[PDB]
């Protein structure tokens, strides 16, 4: 009664028989905005089931050389579903997330992925190598949306910070000999009650292979990693026309 689990939101149900418990970011369940924490005076929308549900956004292929990937969040779910709509139509957005990363293999494969949530995940550049040039990461790199983006210098998380310490963040590991999925529930984290789903990404999801994938030849070589996630307590306000970015 701990390695098996079932997550159900809206009209979606995830199943798993080799889980490793559930992490609750900074020990706090997603909640709605207090009546004294808020400022925006207009009465918000809380679509509920039409937005708070599981969206299986993408699949990556784990290879013996993979460096690791990341997805910025608020963003990732735009353009997709009714959630995406309320996000374009409304100025203000607020919500928590249930992130379920899955990846399975056989008892004969081996490897370990680090799945973490890094709030305010600001990306950096190599500064032109020499570090004299003040370059800046493009809209394509900072906000890749679904499809995510691959890291180029995971050791420093492409931001000059040691990944070795990334675990001070709500994380969980996917060690093939042990489990086949990570589940992290993240509460709304920002210095404001609401913010724009468009120009601000409350956090990023990192999926990095710390112990490389390996297996003797002949075993299925296609080990995918799929990202499924669900907004929780989504609230929107500041209605206007639909804006893309």
């Amino acid at each position: 009664s701990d390695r098996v689990a079932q997550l159900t939101i809206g009209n979606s149900t995830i199943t798993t028989q080799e889980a490793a418990n559930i992490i609750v970011g900074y020990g706090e369940w997603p909640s709605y905005c207090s009546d004294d924490d808020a400022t925006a005076v207009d009465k918000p929308t809380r679509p509920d089931v039409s937005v708070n549900r599981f969206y299986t956004l993408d699949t990556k292929l784990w290879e013996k050389s993979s460096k690791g990937w990341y997805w910025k969040f608020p963003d990732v779910l735009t353009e997709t579903g009714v959630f995406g709509q309320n996000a374009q139509f409304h100025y203000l957005y607020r919500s928590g997330f249930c992130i379920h990363v899955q990846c399975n293999a056989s008892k004969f494969h081996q490897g370990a992925l680090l799945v973490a949530i890094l709030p305010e995940y600001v990306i950096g550049t190599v500064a032109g190598g020499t570090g004299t040039e003040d370059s800046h990461p493009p809209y394509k790199q900072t906000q890749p949306g679904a499809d995510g983006f691959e890291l180029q210098h995971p050791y420093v998380l492409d931001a000059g910070i040691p990944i070795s310490q990334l675990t001070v963040c709500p994380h969980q590991w996917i060690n093939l000999r042990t489990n086949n999925c990570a589940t992290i529930i993240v509460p709304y984290m920002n210095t404001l009650p609401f913010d724009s789903a468009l120009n601000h990404c409350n956090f990023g999801l990192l999926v990095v292979p710390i112990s490389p994938l390996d297996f003797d030849q002949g075993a299925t070589p296609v080990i995918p990693i799929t990202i499924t996630l669900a907004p929780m307590c989504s609230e929107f306000a500041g209605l206007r026309q639909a804006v893309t970015q």
């Binding site: 992490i23 809380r46 990570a182 210095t191």
Partner: protein, 296 residues
């Protein structure tokens, strides 16, 4: 009368579930007597890091321990203890001959990300709320004290930024200014937590404008206005050449600190302010290195 699913519908629960509680911890935890344990079914030592939680194994479960009454204080590890230490965050030059700041006045954009020591400490957290004590140490480049009168002026964003030593803005009718001689002890003043956000943000993963976000504008990524507190202007009070080359060092001591969401400590040399850029060709290891894992 209602539809039920509306009556239960927990939508609109403003309070967070919690799951953890803050307990008193004035001293380090004491060690209690432990004895041998030879049994099945109970394995403290065994853990599953995958879960994402730190090993809760106690010393008592790994060895027969004595009893120790730990009375070591944990006071010096509080945020206030750790942060309420004045540190250099700004430096302003007011030379006689030069290209930097002649004319006799300067405008320092209030940004503490300019110096490595202080910057790294704060970049330990994602959000920080606090008041501060700013102290201004002025003198000549030789470190000599000179009979010169200065005027420091905090210029909130939106206020007229002085364009010359004799700018009308120095009337400082509503801005807070300070007049000090370099012969008087360094000026010190108390600043509150100004900012429309509930906390200053060391890292802002996003943009502030809502536009096209083309190449040229990638300069604005990570730029969060809730952190731009305005500028700090200084001038030698008068209408003629200073007569002495000056320098002002700005020290900041945080107080009444609250911090949130710890992050990994800075790994690579810093390159620019409000921009985590690192040197791609000089990516060094977090620390020292050996020759083999089987040798010290």
């Amino acid at each position: 009368d209602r539809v039920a699913d509306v009556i239960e519908s927990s939508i609109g629960d403003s309070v967070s579930r919690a799951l953890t509680q803050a307990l008193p911890a004035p001293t380090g935890q004491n060690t209690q007597v432990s004895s041998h344990r030879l049994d099945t079914g109970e394995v403290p030592a065994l853990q599953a890091a995958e879960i994402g939680a730190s090993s809760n194994t106690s010393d008592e479960s790994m060895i027969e321990t004595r009893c120790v009454l730990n009375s070591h204080s944990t006071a010096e590890t509080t945020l206030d203890s750790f942060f309420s230490r004045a540190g250099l965050v700004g430096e302003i030059d007011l030379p006689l001959e030069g290209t930097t700041n002649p004319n006799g006045y300067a405008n320092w954009d209030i940004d503490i990300t300019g110096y490595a020591q202080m910057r790294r400490k704060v970049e330990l957290f994602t959000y920080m709320r606090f008041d501060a004590e700013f102290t201004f140490v002025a003198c000549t480049p030789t470190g000599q004290v000179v009979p010169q009168l200065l005027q420091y002026m905090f210029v909130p964003p939106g206020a007229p930024k002085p364009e010359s030593r004799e700018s009308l803005a120095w009337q400082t009718a509503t801005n807070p200014s300070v007049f000090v001689k370099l012969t008087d002890p360094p000026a010190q003043v108390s600043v509150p937590f100004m900012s429309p956000a509930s906390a200053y943000q060391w890292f802002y993963d996003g943009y502030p404008t809502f536009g096209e976000h083309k190449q040229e504008k990638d300069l604005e990524y990570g730029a969060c206005p809730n952190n731009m507190m305005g500028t700090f202007s200084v001038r030698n009070v008068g209408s003629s050449k200073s007569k002495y080359p000056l320098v002002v060092r700005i020290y900041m001591r945080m107080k009444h600190v609250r911090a949130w969401i710890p992050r990994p400590m800075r790994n690579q040399n810093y390159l620019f302010k409000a921009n985590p850029n690192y040197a791609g060709n000089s990516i060094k290891p977090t620390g020292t290195s050996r020759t083999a894992i089987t040798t010290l």
